Amino acid sequence: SRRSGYITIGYRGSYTIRRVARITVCGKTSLAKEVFGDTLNESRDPDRPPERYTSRYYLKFNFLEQAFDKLSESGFHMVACSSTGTCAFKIWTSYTEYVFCRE
Amino acid sequence: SRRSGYITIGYRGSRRVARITVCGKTSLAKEVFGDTLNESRDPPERYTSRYYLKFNFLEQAFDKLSESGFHMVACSSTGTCATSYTEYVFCRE
Amino acid sequence: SRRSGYITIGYRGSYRRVARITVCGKTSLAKEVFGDTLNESRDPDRPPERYTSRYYLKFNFLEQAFDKLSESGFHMVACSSTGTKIWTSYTEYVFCRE
Amino acid sequence: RRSGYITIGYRGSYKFRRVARITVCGKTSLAKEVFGDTLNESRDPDRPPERYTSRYYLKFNFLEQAFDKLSESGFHMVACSSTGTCAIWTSYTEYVFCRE
Amino acid sequence: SRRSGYITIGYRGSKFRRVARITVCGKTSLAKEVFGDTLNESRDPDRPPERYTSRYYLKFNFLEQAFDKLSESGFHMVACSSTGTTSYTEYVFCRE
Numbered sequence A: 001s002r003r004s005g006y007i008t009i010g011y012r013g014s015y016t017i018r019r020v021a022r023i024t025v026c027g028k029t030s031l032a033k034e035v036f037g038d039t040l041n042e043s044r045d046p047d048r049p050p051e052r053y054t055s056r057y058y059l060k061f062n063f064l065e066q067a068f069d070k071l072s073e074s075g076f077h078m079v080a081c082s083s084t085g086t087c088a089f090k091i092w093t094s095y096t097e098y099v100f101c102r103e
Numbered sequence B: 001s002r003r004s005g006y007i008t009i010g011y012r013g014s015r016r017v018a019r020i021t022v023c024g025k026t027s028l029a030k031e032v033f034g035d036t037l038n039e040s041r042d043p044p045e046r047y048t049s050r051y052y053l054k055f056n057f058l059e060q061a062f063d064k065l066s067e068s069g070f071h072m073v074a075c076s077s078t079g080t081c082a083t084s085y086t087e088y089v090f091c092r093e
Numbered sequence C: 001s002r003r004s005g006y007i008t009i010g011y012r013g014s015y016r017r018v019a020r021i022t023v024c025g026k027t028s029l030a031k032e033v034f035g036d037t038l039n040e041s042r043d044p045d046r047p048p049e050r051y052t053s054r055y056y057l058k059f060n061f062l063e064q065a066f067d068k069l070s071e072s073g074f075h076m077v078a079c080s081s082t083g084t085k086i087w088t089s090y091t092e093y094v095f096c097r098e
Numbered sequence D: 001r002r003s004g005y006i007t008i009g010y011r012g013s014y015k016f017r018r019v020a021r022i023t024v025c026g027k028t029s030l031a032k033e034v035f036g037d038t039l040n041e042s043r044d045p046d047r048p049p050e051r052y053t054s055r056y057y058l059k060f061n062f063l064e065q066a067f068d069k070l071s072e073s074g075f076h077m078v079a080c081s082s083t084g085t086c087a088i089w090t091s092y093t094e095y096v097f098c099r100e
Numbered sequence E: 001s002r003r004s005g006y007i008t009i010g011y012r013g014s015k016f017r018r019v020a021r022i023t024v025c026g027k028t029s030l031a032k033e034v035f036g037d038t039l040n041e042s043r044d045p046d047r048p049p050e051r052y053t054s055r056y057y058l059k060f061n062f063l064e065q066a067f068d069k070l071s072e073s074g075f076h077m078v079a080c081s082s083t084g085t086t087s088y089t090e091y092v093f094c095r096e
Helices: A029-039 A064-073 B026-036 B058-067 C027-037 C062-071 D028-038 D063-072 E028-038 E063-072
Strands: A005-016 A023-028 A053-059 A077-088 A091-102 B005-013 B020-025 B047-053 B071-079 B084-092 C005-014 C021-026 C051-057 C075-083 C088-097 D004-013 D022-027 D052-058 D076-085 D090-099 E005-013 E022-027 E052-058 E076-084 E087-095
Touching (some): A023 A029, A064 E005, A077 B071, A091 B058, B005 C062, B020 B058, B071 C075, C021 D063, C027 C051, C062 C075, D004 E063, D022 E063, D028 D063, D076 E076, D090 E076, E063 E076
Antiparallel strands (some): A005 A023, A023 A053, B005 B020, C021 C051, D022 D052, E005 E087, E022 E052
């Protein structure tokens, strides 16, 4: 409870009438670092103080469930999930986010 | 974590978090967010759907709800191509 | 519990603008929860054990409906939304009292 | 009582909800336990108890009546999702139930 | 628990429901423990248990049969999302 809070995992996918390019991490930087350690890629947002938030971290691996398993090992649980679709000329893409919480 | 009710967190995206809206009992929202809350509407009603937050990190809003004993119980989003609107429902028992 | 059951709350939006909050479920549960804030005009004088999909509420704050459900011991167990210069949407929030 | 999942499907059309068919998917013995004679097996008849179906439906049209019967048999809603089909406007929503 | 983790079940969709292929994503040891011989590892074969995959799929067609097997191994459904224009729906399962 002293280090409670939220981490959101994001994933951009595409379907043609799973393939991963980048798993994004949003939340307080100290929490994301505790959970993911050196798998965290902070290049898009470097050198932030621990009590600041980020929406631009991402992970050095490409399996979604691999991110979820690490969150579970740190006592975070999935509490929500949403997805939004898009149509294009055929390919259709979507961004999915998975909200995790530690009590 | 004293008096029960719902607070809904919303934002419209294209992540770029333009503005985080707060809906619910006005007294509950002020308990949770204090001066991070700009009301921006002129007397106040018991319920609002037009409060919004000064900061732009969604998880920072979620974390403050957690500190007051609110839990996320649902979320939904809708989009049409030309953006999207996402909503997160919190509840304190 | 003997008075257990589901109530679904819905509303049509456009892009928050809430025109009307709909209420679906067994009528006696809806009446227990919302009392005089319930508008039964589109399905009046129903027996307490029959189901309706046509009640709505006389207020337009969604969280006020959620708060009343909580006061009667109902909890939100699911949520879904369907989308389409203005696009409309329907969102429903499923509540359950066990 | 044996564990399992039952999914409830609802073809909707769009303030009120469009009265339509409520479909039931899962192991047939579970669906029959839950719904009894409100279950319509005419599109998948004479199935053995341990086989699965995705073609049962209910003889009433109120979704919450189906949710209530699931609750009476100890099933709980664990997920839901809908698909928007723009063309009025029709959507399909499914509600996943689980008895552990 | 020692063998805790996530398995995500997917189906590409378009009496109504028609499901062709049920995809399985997660750690390969977990997918194998849950699904055994019903699992199709041909698309991603010769994989060590501690590695992850997004290319397994199931030999049967009933989504609830996949859900029931997950339950039998102590996995629970924690989230669900769908997107479409045809549709793709995924069900996230977790064993603590």
